Every structure is written in C-alpha cells, then in structure tokens.
Design an enzyme around this catalytic site. Structure first.
Site, PDB file in Angstrom:
ATOM      1  N   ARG B  53      -2.251  16.369  17.562  1.00 47.66           N
ATOM      2  CA  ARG B  53      -2.296  17.790  18.426  1.00 47.66           C
ATOM      3  C   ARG B  53      -3.108  17.552  19.740  1.00 47.66           C
ATOM      4  NH1 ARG B  53      -5.073  21.643  15.869  1.00 47.66           N
ATOM      5  NH2 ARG B  53      -6.778  21.598  17.580  1.00 47.66           N
ATOM      6  N   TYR B 105      13.763  32.534  36.151  1.00 45.79           N
ATOM      7  CA  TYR B 105      14.444  32.424  34.900  1.00 45.79           C
ATOM      8  C   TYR B 105      14.103  33.655  34.131  1.00 45.79           C
ATOM      9  CZ  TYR B 105      14.883  30.985  30.244  1.00 45.79           C
ATOM     10  OH  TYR B 105      15.215  30.843  28.815  1.00 45.79           O
ATOM     11  N   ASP B 178       8.281  25.838  39.639  1.00 43.28           N
ATOM     12  CA  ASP B 178       9.068  25.347  38.403  1.00 43.28           C
ATOM     13  C   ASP B 178      10.372  24.456  38.957  1.00 43.28           C
ATOM     14  OD1 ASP B 178      11.307  25.203  36.562  1.00 43.28           O
ATOM     15  OD2 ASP B 178      11.029  27.029  35.976  1.00 43.28           O
ATOM     16  N   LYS B 203      16.345  20.986  29.982  1.00 39.26           N
ATOM     17  CA  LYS B 203      17.179  20.704  30.725  1.00 39.26           C
ATOM     18  C   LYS B 203      17.670  19.441  31.123  1.00 39.26           C
ATOM     19  CE  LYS B 203      17.294  25.058  30.138  1.00 39.26           C
ATOM     20  NZ  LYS B 203      16.901  26.013  30.755  1.00 39.26           N
TER      21      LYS B 203
HETATM   22  C1  LIG Z   1      -6.279  22.636  11.096  1.00 41.95           C
HETATM   23  C2  LIG Z   1      -6.405  24.100  10.560  1.00 41.95           C
HETATM   24  C3  LIG Z   1      -5.612  24.992  11.286  1.00 41.95           C
HETATM   25  C4  LIG Z   1      -4.979  24.827  12.645  1.00 41.95           C
HETATM   26  O1  LIG Z   1      -3.674  24.086  12.547  1.00 41.95           O
HETATM   27  P1  LIG Z   1      -2.986  23.158  13.530  1.00 41.95           P
HETATM   28  O2  LIG Z   1      -1.679  22.745  13.113  1.00 41.95           O
HETATM   29  O3  LIG Z   1      -3.883  21.703  13.437  1.00 41.95           O
HETATM   30  O4  LIG Z   1      -3.304  23.556  14.869  1.00 41.95           O
HETATM   31  C5  LIG Z   1      -6.020  26.402  10.903  1.00 41.95           C
HETATM   32  N1  LIG Z   1      -6.446  26.818  10.031  1.00 41.95           N
HETATM   33  C6  LIG Z   1      -7.174  25.754   9.113  1.00 41.95           C
HETATM   34  C7  LIG Z   1      -7.810  26.316   8.207  1.00 41.95           C
HETATM   35  C8  LIG Z   1      -7.033  24.507   9.619  1.00 41.95           C
HETATM   36  O5  LIG Z   1      -7.728  23.830   8.625  1.00 41.95           O
HETATM   37  C1  LIG Z   2      14.965  27.473  30.442  1.00 41.22           C
HETATM   38  C2  LIG Z   2      13.961  27.420  31.524  1.00 41.22           C
HETATM   39  C3  LIG Z   2      12.548  27.547  31.589  1.00 41.22           C
HETATM   40  C4  LIG Z   2      11.885  27.648  30.099  1.00 41.22           C
HETATM   41  O1  LIG Z   2      12.811  27.244  29.192  1.00 41.22           O
HETATM   42  P1  LIG Z   2      12.439  26.569  27.593  1.00 41.22           P
HETATM   43  O2  LIG Z   2      13.758  26.653  26.941  1.00 41.22           O
HETATM   44  O3  LIG Z   2      11.382  27.444  26.771  1.00 41.22           O
HETATM   45  O4  LIG Z   2      12.338  24.909  27.733  1.00 41.22           O
HETATM   46  C5  LIG Z   2      11.627  27.520  32.709  1.00 41.22           C
HETATM   47  N1  LIG Z   2      12.287  27.389  33.719  1.00 41.22           N
HETATM   48  C6  LIG Z   2      13.742  27.314  34.064  1.00 41.22           C
HETATM   49  C7  LIG Z   2      14.299  27.034  35.499  1.00 41.22           C
HETATM   50  C8  LIG Z   2      14.411  27.286  32.927  1.00 41.22           C
HETATM   51  O5  LIG Z   2      15.848  27.183  33.199  1.00 41.22           O
END
Ligand SMILES: *Cc1c(COP(=O)(O)O)cnc(C)c1O
Ligand SMILES: *Cc1c(COP(=O)(O)O)cnc(C)c1O
Ligand SMILES: *Cc1c(COP(=O)(O)O)cnc(C)c1O
Lengths: 390, 390, 376, 376
Positions: B53, B105, B178, B203
């Site tokens: 992550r 958007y 953007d 896109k």
């Molecule tokens: C790791 C963990 C999370 C967060 O999940 P991610 O997918 O790592 O962001 C939340 N709660 C518990 C108990 C965890 O062990």
């Molecule tokens: C689609 C779009 C986004 C955000 O879209 P996602 O589908 O969540 O990736 C932001 N800016 C513009 C101009 C867009 O067309």
C-alpha cells in the site's frame, strides 16, 4: 463450546455470484472484465462505467455478502479506503468513538486526518461496556470497533455494544472483522450495522491483493454507501477482484488450518519458560475466552506474545527465525513475525502504545499453513537462541 | 505555430523507471510484483519496501515515468481520477475554501458539491475562463484552485500561466490543473505554473480502456510529502497489474496522441463543413475562441471533438443511433471512437448545465485511432440519416 | 493404514522457489515477470536469463516448487498436459516403440494413435492392470511406457513399483506415470521408481479451474537435459502469469486435497449405502479390488467417485438432470463438484468430481437426485 | 513507390472480433475468460484469431504458445518420408528445429537460397510437401519474391508455402495476398510489440489446411494463455502507429549508418542500396525497424561498439518498443553451425539493430557516440 459452524458456508463461497447462466460462455469461473466502458443501446438506458461498476467486482461482492450473511457488499482499493469511505457517511460536527486498540493505519487516519474535517475522535475501551456507554453523546454517529484487536487481541462483546449503541438513536456500529473472517465471526448476526474487512489479509489469504470489503443489511445505509463508492472512486481493480474471489474458494479450508496451527503455537508458547505472556482467544488464559466461544465458531492464526527480557531479546528472537518471516501484514499462507511497536503500529503515538501495552517486548505472529512441527521447531529454536532471563 | 514538442518525451516514456539494473534478472520490462509484503533484515529499517500500500516496485516505476513525462520531480498513482481528487482535497481543513472551474467533469462537480462541502469546505464555482473573475473570487480562506482545460465537454480553454500568476500573487494557495484531456504530451501545466498536474489515467494516459487510474504530478517538496502521506493514509491505491498495464499504455502515448490529433483534426474540419452541423468546438480550429491561446500553451490537440447538430434532441438521438463505427458509450481517450450526449449521459449530475450550454443538441466525440476515411464516412452517413433542417 | 503423509509437504509447497532473497525488493511472493528479454552485460556471457522461452523467473520458481513436491531434482513446465506428452515423446526417434496403457486418457490416446504414429513410432496398447501382460509386450525397440493411475473413469489402480522393475530390467526404457488425478500430496511415482512423473496441472495441482498447464518431474540427469532441450526448442511453453496462478494454487494443495478426500470418502460411503446404487468404484473403500495396493502406494485418495446407478440410462439421466449442487460439466479436479455421464463404461456409469462444498449439502443433493430417478 | 497501404487496417485492428454484442455486459474490450470448465476454444483466443485473420486478409488464424510451437504444429501436417525445403538463412530456432529435431522423425531437411528462384525450382522433389520461407531473412535481411516463389511451388501439386512474416507484420506485407499458403508469426516480436508476451500466430485461407491445423492445435496442446491472448490483442491495437514509427526510425538509422565512415556496409530493405530494394517496393507497403550492418574492423570493434551503447540495450529479441542491439554470431544465432554462418555472412562483425520508438535524435546520437568510441 464454540458457536456451531455456519451452515452452507463453503457451498456459498464456491457458488455465489458464480452462476454460469450469467455469461454467453456458461463458464464456471467468471471472466475478468477489464473494460472501462460499455456500449449503450440508446442514450437514456446494464453497465455504463467500470468504476460504478462492473461484472467482476459484482461477483466478488455478491459472494462476500453471502459469507457475511449480508444483503449487500461493497469492495474498495484497500481496508483504509473502505474506512475512509465509511467515515464519509458523516458530516462536520459528528463524533466518532473508536476502540482504543486498533490497526495502526486506522488510528492514524482518525487522529490525524478525519479530525481536520470537523469530526471529533474519541478513543475508548469499549472492551468494557460502561466506558463506552459513558462516552456516547448526542453528537456520536459512528462507533468503530475491532475484535479481536490488532495487536493486543482484546475482545469486545459485539451484541453488548450493539444493544447499547442502538438505544441512543441513529448511530452506526462498524466491526472490523479482518482478523476473524466471516468464517469465524458474523458481526452482522450479532447486531452490527457494518462488518468491514481488510481483504489484504485472510479474505484473500494469498499476500498478493490489497483490498477492502464492507458488508451491510440496512437499505438506506447501503444506498448512502453505494453513492460514496462511485463518488470517491476508491475502487479495486477487476483483476484484484478476481484474485480475491479466487482466494475465497479456500477460505474455509484455510481458516480451519490457521486455527489448528495457531492453537498449537499458542499452546507451545504458553508452556515455554522464555515467554512472559501469551494472548490468544483460543486459550483459556484469555480474559474474554468464554465470550469468544459465544461470538465465534473458532480462532484464527494471530498469536501475540511478550517475550521475557527486553527489546534486545525480542530482536535476537526475530533474527533467528528461519521459517517465520520478519514482515508486516498477516493472514497469508506464510508465517510472519512482527514487532508492532516499531513496525506496524509505529504510527500510533508512543504514549498511546504504552497505555495499550504495545511494549518493545510484544511480538505478533501470523501463523501460516506450514507444517505444525516445523513452525514449532522454528519457534523453539529461536527462543532458545534468545534465552532471556527466565 | 504550436509550442515545439517536448524534447525527450518518447525516449523518456520508454526508459524512465524501467532500468533493467533494478531487477536481479535484468528484465527489460519491469516485473509485476503483486506481493503484499517484503522481508525485512531488521525491525524498523530505513531501506526497501515494507507494505504494498505504501508501497511498491511496479507502482513506483510508473510514478517515475509519469513524473518525467510531466516534467515533474514526483508522481503519485491512485485507484481512480476521482480518488486522486479526493486525496488532493484532503490536503486541506475545515474552514478552507476551494474554487473550482465551472464546466468541470461531472464527477469532480459532484464530489465538490455534494461530498466535500459537508466537511466544512466552502465550494465556489467560477468561470475561470474569465481570468479577472477568478481574481475577484479569491478570499483569505481560499486554499485550492481547481481547473480543467480544455473543459469537458464544452472545451473552454483556460490560461494556465495567467491563472497561475493570479493564484500565486497572495497567500498560500494551490493550483491544480486536470490535464486528462490533453496528456502531458500536448500540455505541461507544471511548466506553466500549476502546483499540481492531475490525470484521470483511465483516459488518454492508459489509452486502452481497461484501467481505471489516477495520477498526480508535482514539483514542490513539502506539497509532495503532504500528498505522499495521504496516498498511504487514505489508501486509495492502484493495483500493481493496473500499474503495469498503464505503464504499458504509456509506451505508445506519443504515437497514439499524434494519431488522435490527425484524426481529431480531420473530423473537426469535416464537421465544420457539414450543412447539418450548427457549431464545432475544437481547439485546433481557427474558429475556436481561444485558438491562439491553444497554440501558446500546447504543442497540439487531441481527439476530443464536440459539436452541436442542427435541429433538436430527436436529431441528436437519430444521429447517435445511426453510428456504425463510433460506439455510443461514456468514457474517452481510448483507441476506439466514442460518441456521447453529455446532457443525458456523462454529465447527468440541469440549471448550471443550461448556463454552460450543455443542451440536447450538444455532442461529445472521442475520435480514436481508426482509419480517417472510415470515421468520416460514418459521420456522413449518420448525419444524413438524421438530416436536420439545414 | 496408508503410507505416512510425506514430511514437510505443506512447508515446501509454501516456501520452495519463493525465497525473498531472489528479488531486490525481498518480496515474500515472487513478482510476475512477463519480460521477453533481459539486458546482457556482454555478448554471449555464460550467465543469467536471456530469452523468456528459455526461460524465466516466474516459471523457474514454479518448477522448483513442483520438483520439491514430487520429491524430484528437476521439473519442467509446459503450456498444457498434452504439450508435455508431446515434448516427452519428442524424446524418441523414428523406429522406437512406445507402450501405452489400455484405459488411458482420451487426449494422450488421440495424440499417440493419430499423430505420433505418423512419424515412425510404433504405438501398441496394453492392460497394465496385470503385470505379466506388460512383460510380454516389451520389444528390443521399446523405449517408453506410459501409465496412468488410478485410471479415469473406471479407476483401476496400477502397481507402479511393480511395472518399474519389469520395465527397468530391459534397459533403456522410460517409465512415465501420469499423476494428474492423485497429485504429489497423495502419490509420488518417482519414489516408486517411475522415471517421469507427469501432470496435467489444469486439474488438482492448480485446483482452481482457470489454468491449462502441464508439468514433468524427473530425477535422471541426462533425461532432464534432453527434456530441457525440447522445452526450449519446441516452445510449448507456459505463460508467466499461468505459472504464477498455478504456483498460487499449489499453496493450498494440502488443505484442498485433505478436503477432497474427506468429502469423496463421505460421498463414496453414502453411495455404497444406497439401495439405488448398483456399485461404487472408489480406491478408499475396502470394497475396491485394488484397495490394498492403494494403501501401500498412496497416502490417501481423491474426490473422484465413480458409481453405477440401478436401472438404465433413463435413470442415470433423471438423476443427472435433477442435481442441484453438482454441475454437469466435462472436467475435474476443481473446487466445484461436477457430475458426468462418461459414455455420453456402460449405459449406467456416472462420474463425480467431488469438490470442497459442505458435506451435508453434497449428500443431500445426491440423495434428492437418486429419489427423483427412483420414487416413492 | 511502395505498395499502397491496405485499406481499413486500423479500423479492423481495433474492431474485428471486438464486437460488444458477444457479451452480456456489452463490454467494449473483450473479457479475459479464464475458465477450463463449461456448464452443460475460448472467447479471448477467438477474438484474437479473428483480428489477426482480418489483418492478414485471411479467413482463419490459429494462436500458439510461441512462434516455435507454431512451426512445430505446421511440420506436424506432414508424415515420415516427406521433405521440407527451408530458406538457408532462417531464425536460429527454426534452423535448430528442422536440423536437430524434425530430421529425427523421418523428414528430409534441405536448405536452399530461395532469394534465387532458379535454385528453389531445381530443388523441388516429388516428395517435397512444405517450403519454408522467411522474408526478409533474420538477420542477413535477404529478401524473397513471395509471389514468384508461390508460382514456382504451386506449379506441381500438394506443396505448402509457409511465409514467416514476423519482421514485416501484416501492416507491411501480406504473404497470403501474394500466393502464400500460410502466413506465420512469432507474435512475441512486432505483433505484440510490447516485449511481454511469448506467442505464435498462423494465418491461412485454404479450407482443408485450416481443419488440419485446427486439429493439430487441439491435439498437440501448445495453446496460448487466455491472458496472453488478451495482451497481444491489446498490442495489435497500436500495430499501425507502432509500425509506422518503426519505419521512420529504422529509415533514419539506416541512412545515418550508411553515411558513417566507420560502417563497412548496411543492409536495410528501405535503402536503394539493398540489392532487392526494387522488389521490396513491389511487394511491401513499407519497412520495419530492423537494421543490420557490418562495422569496419574486427570482433573487438563490434564489442566495444556494443559496450558503449547507452540507449540501445544489449539484449536478444526484437520488434518491441525499446531499441535493441545484438551480435548474431555470438548471441541470437549461436544455434546455427559455425560453418553455416560463415557461408551466410553472419560474421564476427555483423550487428543487428531492432529500432524502437524513442526519439530519432537520441537514437542517432547513441550510435554516433558508440561508433566514435570504437574508432577514435
Ligand atoms: C491491515 C488492516 C487494515 C487496513 O487494510 P489495508 O488493505 O492494509 O489498507 C484494517 N484493519 C485491520 C485490523 C488491519 O489489520
Ligand atoms: C473521468 C475524469 C476524471 C476522473 O475519472 P476516473 O474515471 O475516476 O478516473 C477526472 N477528470 C476528467 C477530465 C475526467 O474525464
Ligand atoms: C523469434 C522468432 C521466431 C520464434 O518465435 P518465439 O516466439 O521466439 O518461439 C520465429 N521466427 C522469427 C523470424 C523469429 O524472429
């Protein structure tokens, strides 16, 4: 003395969301739909945009609901994205009560981030009912708990908290069921409003997907949460969706084995003269043991212990492990060991850790699916090598 | 008369982040590392990855490549464009104000209006096309200026450099651009004074309609750290496969964007000469109001063509229904041509949309990479079937 | 009283080939390397990866793990089980004879009879269920003997070790055992004396019904070298991602196989109880004519249950058509339960691939389907 | 002066086999269908085959796990006692398979300089059944008159012409249009173009030929992974823009080298100095990025040249987005006999470039600087 296992669990894990009648192929395993758009039959119209979303996220979602015994499930980029999305159900002025012992990243998010946006965060234990009762306010709108807690494995009475949080009115109780999985515990059957998982752990179980899952029953809650799913866009990849759905197929035979191995490890550690204290809900030494048998159908592979001596002894112990691996994360097939205070929970303020008992002498183990005998030989071997004051 | 093309773009798209010496195999294409954790030599290290992550080899290459194409020092990848926005606005606090471009958007509109405002953020929409209006709208509480150019779908063009000067004159306020429509191949908002260059990678960046993804390019040291922290704490992170795929898409960004521009130009010219077309809005055309601005701030134009068919909704609908090559669908920027009706589809989220001139008559084309002759022949046929009053 | 479970299996299934010291990142799970080429330090240096064919990090880890799981020195991964069979036969030359089993899998059959024969290989088929029959067939040109056990679907068991002595007494002949339906958790043909232990990983090894993949495990040095040469030169090669997915599936082979056995046993005992079942063929039953061989040769059994229903084809069809949990499909070795009428090996023979769903449910579904066939 | 571009190529690369009505989702890009079981070939492969078929101007296409496995499936059309005639400069691997593997199963292998049509016509035997041609050849870039060959081979009955079209791709050359029977690709190269799929492709028109191929695709089981199919189909979508930038870049690089006084000779079809330049224009719509040349001096100079490249990478493949260099005599064509190379012109001094899609100024600069370093 445990809650009898949930009927049909494996069958549902295997078959739900997975019906062949869904595809032109008739395929047993659902195709992965990577595509971001979908042809529309006419402008005002199925699927329209992947993020909103798509066939493969949907299959995963129908399956996880089923296993949670839920009407609905929602999937996210990660457990923190699930959390952050869940907190977006609120508004400025709202209060959140959080279990005092909680995933490092959760603590961090509430303390340093959500508190910037007109949200009041109170940390409460919450494994003691009357302290939670005291902390509730007309402002309280989310109560976030974890059981057992990461890393201290404090256990909360979920139906207890449920009855008390719902007397006060419009308050959402979330249970992060990451450690147990819906195989061993169903927060929703015990009266929770939400049962949340970091699927990164046991749910997927294969250490190759980062993901969050949120399961719900309440109609209006689901709708509010679905909105946030589309609007925040904290969405998982269709391939991630697939891999995780593949992992679920063996959740039952994985959790059973984590149970066996975990149990043996915690028994071996508790008889070992170099170990000060072992915390594991499956043992009768655990202060909430009887509670655990009332809420859960078994236990997981998470065993936390304190080694006798000092951080130096903890370190020599970690450095001598030849099968467990010194790493963060948990719930995977491979055994991992960890020193929460300096690794996974470093983002929890030092004073908060010390009140909690996350000392330099606390080790969290994630017992994997290796041979019992080998996990046992490795721990014996490493503790011998550390030989703290006995 | 456009800005000359950016110097080592094609070379950088193919090599940056991609050095074989990174892998023990010396592989020429970076491996996809799904792994959720990594072994640590000792508890609490500076070195190496610790948790996906936070987090990981394949995302980090992609981030390195995009930074280079944006001419920036850092990039950060996210689960979606939307999640990139959510993360960015988490940069702020209650009592802060965000100013947002007016035709933006649909999704950015909604999050700002209906989600961000519930957390003590004041949201004001300002026609930043008229620079002085922006200068007028700025208050002591203004922390973020959010801009999109060209605007989706009406394609107003904003003077980034002019906005940047104004937004930077007093106080500590961030300018986001953007740049989704343009790709860093055609426009570098950072070179022109923006603090952040943001993408919906879904896109053009990806180009293959099979990854949902977000991207934030940034130069400023302390703004980066503030972003990096949020990337980890909110967890709106992208799958490594998606990272792999998107980086794979980028390898042809230059050759794709050149074709979108050739094809885009020919479609626009064709529409401008057609008796069934009321108005064509396309940056590359002499007839676009900000045409000369386009040439000072961009090295070219894109496959986004919007026009207003003559007549009525019925006429728009019939034209859309008659397309055989262009597909009626909601995304953009892919290899295949898409036709859409903003009013009733992509921009469903009415008043503000009459003011912006998002009427029944208005059509958004995403011209793709098919043969020009076929594209033209498809439009012709379809305009002919609708045959509006001319 | 089966063979003791092989020591350290789970541990090796999870860790062999997965050493995080392999990757600069120390990833606990190996990266998927799609890369087709690799930077070289100088032209024709002896070392490292050069061409994905050839091969590659992700494939290599899988080979290492499977080899360990078979208790072998080496393993080679192929695009499918048939492709493995083909590479194996390219081990020969015009004028060689191969001997194949009587009840062999349709695939290897079709390739031998219809393709391999066209190039100067004599194929001749034989019941290896009786060992003296195999003696008689051996020829000065016999170069390969192909065995599969339990056979599918009649489930006859072949004394592997027996055939190994017979075959090895005559020089210079390869014994291949197709271990597709046991997996190395339950049976190790190499420890039994086979020269090659072959898989269609598509089935139990991966167990997730989403990979086609063949696997060949070997000990003999020269035979490995020959095999590796055919791996690179014929190019019937696995995609790195399939490699990854099959390795992923291996990580639960132990817990998956225990459950198949548990469930298969329960289904078998249920059918052997049922008055509407003429006969059950399942190696874990004392009722199975080679049950004793099975306990000396295997550590347990699988989810494959064959049975004959009372009545005729009609009754078989009514049963199959009334299954609500078991799916009608033509594969096996996956996590899902499948039922199949393998003739359409008489009118009345039904094959089950018993999966990992709940016992109570699988039994109730069978019971309910038998009742539809035979009322009340 | 080249053949006019093929009408509709781009449109068809993007939409053929990609029709959204095939799926309940109406997904614009086809799903990746992983299943190996089906409730009573696969969709992702099928879409890819249709697209390649269209691009080749072909009725059919078959996908394989590598171009090497495509060559093997093809040879399997024949029976023992038959003869193959192969172009004398082929891909090391094609040479190896024919010479070292095929020849062990009753097939006769002959190598002939088919760039001299007279020599091919003399070579034909009553039991020739297949003629195998590569054009331009790898790596000496010798060009064959596909059409002239086709007429010579089809003059007397039941012989198959395969054209390995890996270097050109169907954007620049359509062997089937020119009278060939099979147009074969290692898709691992230009067709995918992204250096991350190992695959083979075979296009055919003849009805009986296809059924035969289709049979062998099934029976030999060297099928590609559905995921790989997805990925290659995704690569194809940029074929026309890729191949066009390869043409410009390649051309600029050949020009530069031909003007460089440290270069002995350059071989590139798009140059007037290529002995078959005129033929290239009658037969092809353009040229690729493959540029081969001979450095002035000895092996040391080639080697020093390669060591100083800083943009081109020393690696063993071709046709991807990254610029690549190698020295065939020591790397990519080590599997061809020493004595074979000397006759073929693969000397110590031959360098093969695969020019990619980086900026032209940088690629020329990198070659300039590498040559300077080898020759001050
Ligand atoms: C790791 C963990 C999370 C967060 O999940 P991610 O997918 O790592 O962001 C939340 N709660 C518990 C108990 C965890 O062990
Ligand atoms: C689609 C779009 C986004 C955000 O879209 P996602 O589908 O969540 O990736 C932001 N800016 C513009 C101009 C867009 O067309
Ligand atoms: C590389 C190559 C092949 C073989 O294909 P693979 O995908 O490497 O098995 C065949 N023909 C030519 C011209 C090649 O360059």
């Amino acid at each position: 003395g445990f809650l009898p296992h949930f009927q049909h669990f494996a069958t549902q894990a295997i078959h739900v969301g997975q019906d062949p009648e869904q595809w032109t192929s008739r395929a047993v395993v659902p195709p992965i739909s990577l595509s971001t758009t979908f042809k529309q039959g006419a402008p005002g119209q199925g699927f329209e945009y992947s993020r909103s979303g798509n066939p493969t996220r949907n299959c995963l979602e129908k399956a996880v609901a089923a296993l949670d015994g839920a009407k609905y499930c929602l999937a996210f980029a990660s457990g923190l994205a699930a959390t952050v999305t869940i907190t977006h159900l609120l508004k400025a002025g709202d209060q959140i009560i959080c279990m005092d012992d909680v995933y490092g990243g959760t603590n961090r998010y509430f303390r340093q981030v959500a508190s910037e946006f007109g949200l009041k965060i109170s940390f409460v234990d919450c494994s003691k009912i009357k302290l939670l009762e005291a902390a509730i306010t007309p402002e309280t709108k989310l109560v976030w708990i974890e059981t057992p807690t990461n890393p201290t494995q404090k256990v909360i009475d979920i139906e207890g908290c449920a009855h008390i949080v719902h007397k006060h009115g419009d308050i959402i109780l979330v249970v992060d069921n990451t450690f147990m999985s819906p195989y061993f515990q169903r927060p929703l059957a015990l009266g929770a409003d939400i049962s949340m998982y970091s699927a990164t752990k046991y749910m997927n179980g294969h250490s190759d997907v980062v993901m969050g899952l949120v399961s719900v029953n309440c109609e209006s809650l689901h709708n509010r949460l679905r909105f946030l799913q589309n609007s925040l866009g904290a969405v998982p990849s269709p391939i991630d969706c697939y891999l995780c759905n593949r992992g679920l197929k063996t959740l039952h035979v994985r959790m059973e084995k984590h149970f066996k191995n975990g149990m043996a490890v915690a028994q071996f550690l508790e008889s070992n003269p170099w170990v000060e204290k072992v915390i594991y809900p499956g043992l009768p030494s655990h202060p909430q043991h009887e509670l655990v048998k009332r809420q859960c159908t078994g236990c997981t592979g998470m065993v936390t212990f304190y080694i006798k001596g000092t951080l130096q002894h903890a370190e020599i112990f970690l450095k001598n492990l030849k099968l467990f691996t010194l790493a963060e994360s948990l719930g995977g097939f491979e055994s991992l060991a960890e020193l929460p205070a300096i690794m996974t929970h470093a983002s929890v303020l030092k004073n908060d850790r010390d009140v909690l008992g996350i000392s330099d002498t606390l080790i969290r183990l994630s017992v994997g699916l290796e041979d019992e005998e080998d996990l046992l030989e490795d721990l014996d071997q490493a503790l011998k090598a550390a030989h703290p004051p006995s």
